[PDB]
Amino acid sequence: SSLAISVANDDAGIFQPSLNALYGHPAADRGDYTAGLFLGYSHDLTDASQLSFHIAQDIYSPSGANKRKPEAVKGDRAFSAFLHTGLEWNSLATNWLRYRLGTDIGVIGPDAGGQEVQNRAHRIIGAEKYPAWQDQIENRYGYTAKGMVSLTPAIDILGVNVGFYPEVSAVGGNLFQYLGYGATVALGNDKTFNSDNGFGLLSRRGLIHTQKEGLIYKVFAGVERREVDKNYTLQGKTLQTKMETVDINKTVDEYRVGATIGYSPVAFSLSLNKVTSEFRTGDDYSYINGDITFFF
Ligand SMILES: CCCCCCCCCCOCCOCCOCCOCCOCCO
Ligand SMILES: [Zn+2]
Ligand SMILES: [Zn+2]
Ligand SMILES: [Zn+2]
Numbered sequence: 001s002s003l004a005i006s007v008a009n010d011d012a013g014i015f016q017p018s019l020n021a022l023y024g025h026p027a028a029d030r031g032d033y034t035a036g037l038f039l040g041y042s043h044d045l046t047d048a049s050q051l052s053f054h055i056a057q058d059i060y061s062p063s064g065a066n067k068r069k070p071e072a073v074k075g076d077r078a079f080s081a082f083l084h085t086g087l088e089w090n091s092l093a094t095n096w097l098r099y100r101l102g103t104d105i106g107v108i109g110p111d112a113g114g115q116e117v118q119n120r121a122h123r124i125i126g127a128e129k130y131p132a133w134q135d136q137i138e139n140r141y142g143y144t145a146k147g148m149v150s151l152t153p154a155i156d157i158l159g160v161n162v163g164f165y166p167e168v169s170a171v172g173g174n175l176f177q178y179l180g181y182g183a184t185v186a187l188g189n190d191k192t193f194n195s196d197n198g199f200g201l202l203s204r205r206g207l208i209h210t211q212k213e214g215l216i217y218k219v220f221a222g223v224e225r226r227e228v229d230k231n232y233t234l235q236g237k238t239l240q241t242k243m244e245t246v247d248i249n250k251t252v253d254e255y256r257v258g259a260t261i262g263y264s265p266v267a268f269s270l271s272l273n274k275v276t277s278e279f280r281t282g283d284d285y286s287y288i289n290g291d292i293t294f295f296f
């Protein structure tokens with residue numbers, strides 16, 4: 001079992017030079033995904049299978065000078081937030097297959113609490129608040145249905161497991177809908193943990209599926225291409241200007257490079273991430289997540 005806290009930020013702090021070297025500086029100049037908070041619990045029903053629960057809030061933002069304007073700007077994403085909770089099954093079907101199946105309920109809109117959380121954060125640090133929260137994406141309550149399958153060929157070399165994990169993912173519902181395909185490569189001291197990967201709404205955000213006690217470590221790099229049918233954060237209508245602000249791009253790539261290091265019962269993770277332009281007038285953006293996972 002693992003209990004995890006994960007924080008995502010486009011401001012990568014001491015990891016900014018690494019993020020910039022990896023994905024280039026223009027991606028850091030964008031601000032599309034501005035904050036994430038996630039708390040999750042995974043329980044092993046067997047050595048092969050987990051059931052996970054989580055609650056999370058993700059906050060999305062216009063970029064650059066648009067952040068300070070009174071309302072949403074045509075051509076850039078509006079302020080929005082996605083507040084969600086759900087359950088997921090994560091299982092090794094065999095030594096060569098991992099699958100995941102999950103359902104969220106949530107909301108994108110003022111009810112997701114993005115203005116409240118960001119305004120609070122800003123007040124606490126003495127930053128000014130961004131007024132265009134008044135023109136945020138309007139409420140839509142909904143569900144996500146999520147699935148992933150991954151092949152898991154890996155070989156063990158002197159206690160180091162190295163693997164290649166081609167995967168297909170799918171999300172549906174009235175908030176987000178896409179079909180993704182990708183692969184991750186990983187090296188680490190645990191076969192099960194090495195195959196436990198994911199992108200986008202299938203990202204594990206700190207949750208760990210592992211057999212290992214004592215030292216745990218993993219280093220990984222992956223990309224997933226998704227074909228996007230829906231993204232309500234982009235296609236929804238703003239509260240006051242009543243517009244859809246952008247034309248979504250139907251093909252979106254997500255890159256993730258990261259690592260975990262831990263010792264029973266605590267592990268630390270960092271993931272350096274890039275998402276390619278999600279709309280015609282946007283551009284690629286980079287961010288990190290840092291996770292603390294108690295695993296026992
Ligand atoms: C008992 C039933 C058996 C079920 C079999 C299920 C197998 C499913 C596994 C499918 O995985 C294949 C997916 O392959 C995708 C790999 O593609 C990677 C390319 O990613 C695009 C990267 O974009 C970057 C472009 O520069
Ligand atoms: Zn357990
Ligand atoms: Zn720049
Ligand atoms: Zn931010």
Ligand SMILES: [Zn+2]
Binds near residue numbers: 001043044
């Ligand atoms: Zn448990």
Ligand SMILES: [Zn+2]
Binds near residue numbers: 054084085086104
């Ligand atoms: Zn969720």
